[PDB]
Amino acid sequence: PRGSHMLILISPAKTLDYQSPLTTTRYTLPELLDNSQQLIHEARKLTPPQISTLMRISDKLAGINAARFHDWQPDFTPANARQAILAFKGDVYTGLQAETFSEDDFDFAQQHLRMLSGLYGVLRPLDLMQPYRLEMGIRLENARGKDLYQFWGDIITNKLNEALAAQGDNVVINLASDEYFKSVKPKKLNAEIIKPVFLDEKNGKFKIISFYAKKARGLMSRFIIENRLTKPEQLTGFNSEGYFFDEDSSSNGELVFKRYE
Numbered sequence: 001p002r003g004s005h006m007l008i009l010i011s012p013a014k015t016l017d018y019q020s021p022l023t024t025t026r027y028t029l030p031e032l033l034d035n036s037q038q039l040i041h042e043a044r045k046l047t048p049p050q051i052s053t054l055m056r057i058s059d060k061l062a063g064i065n066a067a068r069f070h071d072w073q074p075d076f077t078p079a080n081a082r083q084a085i086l087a088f089k090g091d092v093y094t095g096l097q098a099e100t101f102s103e104d105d106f107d108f109a110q111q112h113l114r115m116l117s118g119l120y121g122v123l124r125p126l127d128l129m130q131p132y133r134l135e136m137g138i139r140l141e142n143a144r145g146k147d148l149y150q151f152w153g154d155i156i157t158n159k160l161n162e163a164l165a166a167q168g169d170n171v172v173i174n175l176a177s178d179e180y181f182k183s184v185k186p187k188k189l190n191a192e193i194i195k196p197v198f199l200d201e202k203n204g205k206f207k208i209i210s211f212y213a214k215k216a217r218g219l220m221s222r223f224i225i226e227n228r229l230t231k232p233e234q235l236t237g238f239n240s241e242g243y244f245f246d247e248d249s250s251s252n253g254e255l256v257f258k259r260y261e
C-alpha cells in the first residue's frame with residue numbers, strides 16, 4: 001500500500017442502518033476478519049442476560065445482539081452486509097453526512113479515513129460489515145487477555161501504519177473518542193498526531209459537551225474530505241455551525257475550536 005500523508009480516525013456508532021438507500025454500491029472487505037472471527041467465537045458464549053449486564057443494554061437489545069453474534073459469518077456480501085461509512089448512524093455520522101458524498105468523495109474518504117472498531121479493529125469507509133455491538137472498552141475475555149485492548153495489541157496501529165506513507169511527514173488526525181483511540185499506540189504510529197478538540201460554552205467556560213462534540217468530529221471529518229485537505233494548517237479554517245479556531249488554547253497537538261451558546 002502506498003499510503004498517504006493524512007489519515008483521519010473516527011469512532012464507530014452503536015446504531016446501524018441496513019434499510020436506507022445505498023449512497024454508493026462500491027465496496028471492499030475488512031482486512032482483519034481472522035481476528036474478528038476470534039472475537040465472535042468468544043462473544044457467542046455470552047447468554048442474553050450476560051450481554052445485557054455486560055453491555056448495559058435492554059433485554060431486547062441483548063437478544064438482538066446475541067442473534068447477531070450467532071448469525072455472523074465472514075463471507076460478506078451486499079445481501080448480508082453494508083459499507084461501514086453507510087451502516088453507522090449517530091451524532092458523528094450525522095455530522096459527516098456521507099449520504100451526500102459523491103463517488104469521488106468516497107474515494108478520498110477510502111484513502112484518508114478509518115473507523116476504529118471493537119470487532120473489526122480498523123474499517124475502511126467502503127468495507128462491508130455485518131451488524132454487531134462490541135464497544136472497544138468492553139471487558140471481553142479472549143485468548144490474548146482480559147479485554148479488547150489486550151486482544152488487539154499493536155495490530156490496529158500496524159494496520160494504520162499500512163495506510164500511511166513509508167517516509168515523509170505524515171499526520172494522523174485523531175477525531176475518535178478516547179475509548180477508541182486508546183487502541184492506537186502513539187509511540188508505534190508513523191505520524192504526527194493532531195487532535196481537533198471541540199469546546200462549547202457553559203458558564204463563561206469552554207468545555208467538552210458530548211453530544212455537540214461528537215457531531216463536531218463528524219463536521220470536521222466532512223470539512224477535510226469535502227475540501228480535499230492535505231496539510232494540518234488547513235484544518236484551522238474549520239468553522240462549521242459556529243465553531244472557530246482558538247490558537248492560544250491550542251498546544252501539544254491539540255487544535256482547539258470554541259463555540260459560543
Ligand SMILES: [Cl-]
Nearest residue numbers: 016017018019
Ligand atoms: Cl436495519
Ligand SMILES: [Cl-]
Nearest residue numbers: 011176177214
Ligand atoms: Cl466520538
